[PDB]
Amino acid sequence: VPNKEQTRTVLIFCFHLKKTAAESHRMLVEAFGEQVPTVKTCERWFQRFKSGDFDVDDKEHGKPPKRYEDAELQALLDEDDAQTQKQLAEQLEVSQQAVSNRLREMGKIQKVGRWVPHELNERQMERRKNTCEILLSRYKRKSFLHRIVTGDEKWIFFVNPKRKKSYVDPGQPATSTARPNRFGKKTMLCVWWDQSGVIYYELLKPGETVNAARYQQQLINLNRALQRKRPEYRVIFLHDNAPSHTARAVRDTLETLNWEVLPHAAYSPDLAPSDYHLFASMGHALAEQRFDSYESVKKWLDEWFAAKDDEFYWRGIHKLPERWEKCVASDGKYFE
Amino acid sequence: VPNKEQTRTVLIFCFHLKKTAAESHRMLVEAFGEQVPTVKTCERWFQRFKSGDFDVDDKEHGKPPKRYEDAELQALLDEDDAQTQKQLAEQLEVSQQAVSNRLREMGKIQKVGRWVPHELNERQMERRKNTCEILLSRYKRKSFLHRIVTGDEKWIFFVNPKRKKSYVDPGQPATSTARPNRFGKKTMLCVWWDQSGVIYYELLKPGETVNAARYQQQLINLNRALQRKRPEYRVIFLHDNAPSHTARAVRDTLETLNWEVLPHAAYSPDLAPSDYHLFASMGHALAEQRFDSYESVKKWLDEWFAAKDDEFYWRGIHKLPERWEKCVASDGKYFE
DNA sequence: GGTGTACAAGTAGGGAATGTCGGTT
DNA sequence: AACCGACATTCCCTACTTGTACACCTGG
DNA sequence: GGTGTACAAGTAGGGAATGTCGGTT
DNA sequence: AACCGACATTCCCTACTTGTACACCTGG
DNA sequence: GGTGTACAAGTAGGGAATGTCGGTT
DNA sequence: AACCGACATTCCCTACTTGTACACCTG
Ligand SMILES: [Mn+2]
Ligand SMILES: [Mn+2]
């Protein structure tokens, strides 16, 4: 009856009764019948038993040689880590299924890259690196974030649907969503805030623009609202290089307010707290959220800003230095 | 130095040597030592040996109870098959991790749903059903497909990048891509085709628009090219309800050419061979493609439309029949 | 409309695990 | 009888293969 | 910033697997 | 001695738990 | 975002309708 | 008073323009 495993047990038991090899074998036929391993394989078990080898496991078997080294497929990734299996395959003379396996066998996983706002010129980066160095230099001499009042502009549609993920048996349809229309109803939000909260915001009506003209009016209203909400206020103002924000007219509206405008490189939303922090948070919050009327957008926004904590804003602003640092370490290339 | 499995082999060995249960135990202690099991076990083993049962492995142990039933979790999916695990867990009173497991244990996988072009109206679904019904009723009677000349219009940006997928160790990042610009240079393409190939295409200059005026012009230009390339043509025209396609003026330009316009319910790009099949194949081929010159866009298209085997277009058109059935059986809801 | 990844199942080798057998004591 | 060495036979485990399912793309 | 899934590791508890022991022959 | 039945003790295997990593999101 | 059709409302124009004026008995 | 033709206005009624909905195709 017994298998190589059950057999070796016996031969250990037979070993421990001082039975000789050939003796044990006789007992096996006596016990189980003719169909028991040959004497030769008893003599063998015995020969290793005498060494303290009662190790049950077969010694490691034979294996077809790997038709390509690990470090070989690894060094292909070292040139272009974003190739398909089929592409790697035809460089290693194996199938894709083969390249499927060895990538699973090595620690490797497949992950999808980041979208970055803009392709940056050899120069575009230099400007970033500079600004970031400049601000850090200042940051070390004296913390000044406590003086920062930034703000920016962000669309808010009346419907924000996301593609839905369904848990269902294989080869079945996942509940589907209807596209967000590119030319749907939307209202521009313009919001200004500081490390202690949101100072002032305007929610523009559907078709409304922001021009050198209106921008002025706004930061004068901001000023008015600043006077009451921030009594202690000099003051530092951070905003991106909108065609509207660099307006000859507006530049002067800032001088005549005695506001210091922190330098800001273009295509750098990763350095604008309004974008990388405030809005980013709102992005999550707006998911699948509907707005029937312009009134409710303002009501949601109102309760949304209000129901934030204090630290939330504080944290947004104080992550600047960390970003300026990366912004330099990454040498101007996006760092996010 | 035996285990709760190895000793059982031995007890089988002794059973088949006509040794008494207690006798065998005395042999166990003699051979191995003092850490063998009791005689009480040997007696028990023997008692099941005396039957024909020499099955080594245990009986199934005591296991905790299931806190909810597989089919009870199934009722939640029947309601809403797209729910986060956390949400299911709450309804079941178990943890998320708990549900992560029972979904693994059941057949269930996670799938991303579709983007359907437009949210359809109780009415718009009927329009679709009918039109599909009508055309199919006819196709059954007499195949009118080889007479179908159809066309549409589709943008083509000068840079078509895709997020890149990388094979990498966990934690390490994947190569990032610069985002496609919504406002980049983009030439419009107006193309008309037929079961045997493309008849006449018109690649517009950047700014160029299509109005009641220009559409007519093209329809005539089409006809001329149709006379020499398709020397046999009466023509059936298929085109979507673009405001330009549905102008008073144009319907008359179509009459003057004597073309049967097939009815085509609004919001039905899934029934326009131009979109659902020709541009579809294009979207793939256009991936990661850069176009520096307007000439190359034409040079690309020329060589592309050309190298396309004749059947390709044939299949495109002949897939209408099944889309109609499918459009019909699904009562007008989208069906892709 | 195309394409990319992984589960199936089959297959060839590389040796171990085993057997055979003539040689020793 | 007992055990051995050497060459032959059997078996086991893996790195591949082709075949295939299928998630997700793609045009709106 | 925010959140959704799964790999770790620990824990209870339900019985089997095993032990203990005085009762039979 | 041998084996038993009955009650006690130990051990094994799982369905959960909490803790945590981390892909991917989110603003541009 | 582009674009066309369908009325709903808002200006002009050739007609009217009415007004002014000369004439004659 | 009576009455005309000859023009000049005060208006309409229709008639060309705008103005203000929608409707349909792209991502
Ligand atoms: Mn901005
Ligand atoms: Mn179209």
Side-chain angles (χ1 to χ4, degrees):
Chain A
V1 304
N3 55 318
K4 174 193 66 205
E5 204 189 35
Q6 282 179 341
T7 286
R8 95 178 310 276
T9 306
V10 161
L11 276 77
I12 281 185
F13 180 60
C14 266
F15 181 52
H16 286 112
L17 298 163
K18 201 75 171 178
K19 304 289 165 202
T20 152
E23 273 192 2
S24 308
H25 179 287
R26 292 192 267 119
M27 304 171 67
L28 281 162
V29 306
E30 179 195 350
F32 307 131
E34 175 74 328
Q35 290 187 333
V36 178
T38 67
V39 199
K40 185 60 186 185
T41 61
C42 306
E43 302 176 358
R44 274 167 177 158
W45 275 131
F46 264 51
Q47 190 179 2
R48 77 165 33 152
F49 287 153
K50 299 176 169 177
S51 314
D53 177 352
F54 300 108
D55 278 314
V56 44
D57 338 344
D58 257 4
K59 183 52 208 182
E60 197 188 17
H61 278 267
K63 60 188 182 186
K66 298 182 176 185
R67 313 198 181 200
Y68 65 93
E69 287 293 22
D70 277 340
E72 198 182 334
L73 153 68
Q74 170 61 54
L76 281 188
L77 298 184
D78 280 316
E79 310 165 320
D80 185 318
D81 77 339
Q83 308 177 53
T84 56
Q85 275 171 22
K86 189 190 184 161
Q87 280 172 6
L88 296 180
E90 296 189 6
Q91 286 187 255
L92 307 176
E93 282 124 344
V94 271
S95 81
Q96 152 262 337
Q97 295 86 335
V99 202
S100 190
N101 302 328
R102 285 275 290 282
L103 289 162
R104 181 67 170 83
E105 199 180 308
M106 309 167 66
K108 302 310 177 172
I109 55 160
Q110 173 187 54
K111 49 150 70 180
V112 304
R114 298 188 38 83
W115 271 132
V116 171
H118 187 223
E119 184 68 59
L120 293 197
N121 299 33
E122 310 87 353
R123 165 185 163 174
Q124 312 246 57
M125 293 149 56
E126 283 176 345
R127 302 278 178 194
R128 283 167 57 111
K129 190 177 173 183
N130 269 113
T131 332
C132 286
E133 272 166 351
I134 293 302
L135 295 142
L136 278 176
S137 298
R138 174 172 190 178
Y139 182 72
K140 190 172 196 179
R141 289 174 220 143
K142 217 205 172 203
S143 182
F144 67 94
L145 310 168
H146 323 253
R147 274 200 213 111
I148 290 168
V149 164
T150 191
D152 212 73
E153 299 144 359
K154 176 228 206 312
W155 290 118
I156 289 185
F157 292 62
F158 285 78
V159 59
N160 318 90
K162 307 285 158 169
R163 214 188 320 178
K164 294 167 182 57
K165 285 151 178 135
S166 314
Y167 278 100
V168 74
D169 292 308
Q172 286 215 314
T175 72
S176 60
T177 317
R179 268 164 183 284
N181 184 43
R182 256 187 48 168
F183 320 110
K185 295 194 60 190
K186 59 169 188 285
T187 63
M188 190 155 219
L189 165 51
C190 307
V191 49
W192 292 272
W193 54 293
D194 77 356
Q195 74 147 61
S196 208
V198 43
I199 297 308
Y200 170 78
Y201 80 94
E202 291 185 10
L203 182 53
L204 273 52
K205 305 288 181 68
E208 310 214 85
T209 307
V210 269
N211 52 5
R214 191 198 298 261
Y215 195 37
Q216 287 183 0
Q217 170 71 342
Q218 289 188 332
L219 31 80
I220 291 168
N221 299 109
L222 168 67
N223 200 345
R224 162 148 47 249
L226 215 166
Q227 304 295 301
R228 54 179 176 93
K229 288 183 205 279
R230 296 288 178 276
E232 71 296 336
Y233 290 134
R234 56 196 205 276
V235 144
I236 316 182
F237 189 90
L238 175 59
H239 68 317
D240 66 9
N241 307 337
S244 183
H245 298 163
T246 50
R248 181 69 179 184
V250 180
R251 291 172 61 201
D252 298 356
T253 325
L254 296 158
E255 287 178 348
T256 55
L257 268 77
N258 250 327
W259 283 351
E260 187 174 359
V261 295
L262 279 173
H264 189 285
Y267 315 118
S268 281
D270 50 355
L271 311 169
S274 313
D275 262 338
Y276 76 72
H277 192 281
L278 182 63
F279 296 145
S281 197
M282 203 171 73
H284 290 267
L286 290 159
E288 294 279 12
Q289 179 78 52
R290 263 190 303 168
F291 295 125
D292 48 314
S293 62
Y294 162 106
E295 283 297 311
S296 57
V297 190
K298 256 184 176 166
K299 205 197 72 173
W300 187 82
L301 280 177
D302 268 334
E303 295 166 53
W304 193 72
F305 291 119
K308 279 286 177 183
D309 272 34
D310 278 315
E311 195 181 324
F312 167 77
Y313 298 99
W314 195 101
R315 288 200 307 119
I317 314 298
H318 289 266
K319 272 190 304 182
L320 274 171
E322 182 196 314
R323 291 171 167 276
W324 300 327
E325 277 178 38
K326 300 211 198 86
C327 161
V328 174
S330 52
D331 217 23
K333 291 160 172 67
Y334 294 85
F335 57 91
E336 216 159 19
Chain B
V1 197
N3 53 72
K4 310 221 305 292
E5 178 212 357
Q6 270 174 337
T7 74
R8 194 215 207 272
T9 294
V10 183
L11 293 194
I12 296 175
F13 183 56
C14 294
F15 182 88
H16 288 98
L17 283 172
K18 176 55 191 170
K19 304 294 176 185
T20 256
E23 291 186 354
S24 310
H25 177 285
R26 263 187 274 111
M27 278 165 75
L28 278 163
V29 303
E30 174 196 349
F32 303 138
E34 179 61 10
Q35 288 210 305
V36 185
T38 69
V39 63
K40 189 53 191 163
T41 41
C42 311
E43 294 183 355
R44 283 168 178 155
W45 274 131
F46 259 80
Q47 207 191 1
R48 89 172 68 177
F49 293 175
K50 280 178 172 178
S51 309
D53 163 8
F54 307 109
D55 303 50
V56 56
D57 44 22
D58 279 6
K59 181 51 199 173
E60 190 187 10
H61 281 245
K63 66 204 182 213
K66 284 185 162 197
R67 309 203 187 194
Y68 59 96
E69 285 304 326
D70 277 322
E72 178 189 4
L73 164 68
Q74 178 63 33
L76 300 184
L77 309 188
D78 294 353
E79 275 167 338
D80 198 330
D81 60 304
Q83 297 187 236
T84 71
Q85 282 175 11
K86 195 208 176 189
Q87 296 185 331
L88 296 160
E90 287 168 17
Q91 306 178 244
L92 298 182
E93 312 220 348
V94 284
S95 73
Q96 172 260 324
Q97 298 84 327
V99 179
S100 180
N101 294 318
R102 285 285 280 288
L103 288 168
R104 192 65 159 76
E105 165 174 336
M106 293 162 75
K108 310 291 164 175
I109 63 171
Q110 198 188 70
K111 285 186 76 173
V112 294
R114 292 180 62 86
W115 274 134
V116 283
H118 171 75
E119 185 74 39
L120 292 180
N121 259 292
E122 316 104 3
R123 183 97 161 206
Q124 301 168 328
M125 280 164 58
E126 294 173 356
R127 299 282 188 186
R128 281 182 44 109
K129 196 175 175 189
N130 292 124
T131 46
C132 284
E133 268 168 319
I134 309 303
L135 298 143
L136 189 56
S137 287
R138 183 170 161 186
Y139 171 68
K140 152 92 166 166
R141 261 172 269 150
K142 187 194 170 199
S143 165
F144 63 87
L145 303 176
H146 47 79
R147 281 162 66 190
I148 292 179
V149 161
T150 185
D152 208 294
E153 297 134 332
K154 170 221 168 58
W155 292 112
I156 297 186
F157 296 67
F158 280 74
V159 56
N160 303 145
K162 308 295 186 195
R163 288 172 73 175
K164 292 157 182 61
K165 307 164 170 173
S166 307
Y167 279 97
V168 69
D169 283 338
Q172 294 174 337
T175 60
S176 52
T177 300
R179 208 191 283 261
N181 205 328
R182 255 203 56 169
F183 309 132
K185 297 215 79 169
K186 50 153 165 176
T187 50
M188 172 155 176
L189 173 51
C190 309
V191 50
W192 296 263
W193 59 292
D194 190 13
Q195 77 160 5
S196 299
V198 47
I199 288 325
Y200 165 79
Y201 84 84
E202 206 175 292
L203 176 51
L204 270 67
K205 200 215 182 92
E208 298 305 339
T209 180
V210 171
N211 56 348
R214 186 186 293 270
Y215 197 34
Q216 291 179 149
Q217 177 71 342
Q218 299 178 321
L219 280 167
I220 319 164
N221 288 299
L222 183 67
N223 212 310
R224 179 149 67 252
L226 205 161
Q227 305 288 303
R228 55 176 207 90
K229 280 189 189 293
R230 295 281 194 269
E232 45 287 335
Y233 281 119
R234 67 197 212 90
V235 158
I236 305 174
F237 199 71
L238 178 49
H239 70 320
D240 45 321
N241 297 6
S244 168
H245 293 206
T246 187
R248 293 313 287 246
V250 186
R251 285 139 109 160
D252 299 349
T253 316
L254 292 162
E255 272 172 340
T256 316
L257 291 169
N258 195 31
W259 283 340
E260 181 184 22
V261 299
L262 275 174
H264 172 293
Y267 307 127
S268 298
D270 59 358
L271 310 164
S274 334
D275 264 8
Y276 79 70
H277 178 281
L278 179 62
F279 299 141
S281 185
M282 206 162 74
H284 284 277
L286 290 165
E288 294 288 330
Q289 212 67 199
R290 291 167 298 152
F291 297 129
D292 59 298
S293 57
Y294 170 108
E295 272 65 47
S296 59
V297 182
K298 268 189 184 178
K299 207 193 80 167
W300 194 92
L301 288 157
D302 280 326
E303 299 175 50
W304 194 62
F305 289 115
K308 274 288 172 191
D309 189 11
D310 261 31
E311 181 190 323
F312 167 77
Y313 300 86
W314 187 93
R315 308 193 288 108
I317 307 286
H318 283 257
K319 271 197 290 175
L320 274 153
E322 86 166 24
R323 285 173 183 265
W324 295 330
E325 262 179 337
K326 277 161 85 190
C327 150
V328 166
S330 54
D331 289 342
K333 281 175 160 60
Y334 292 121
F335 54 86
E336 288 171 314

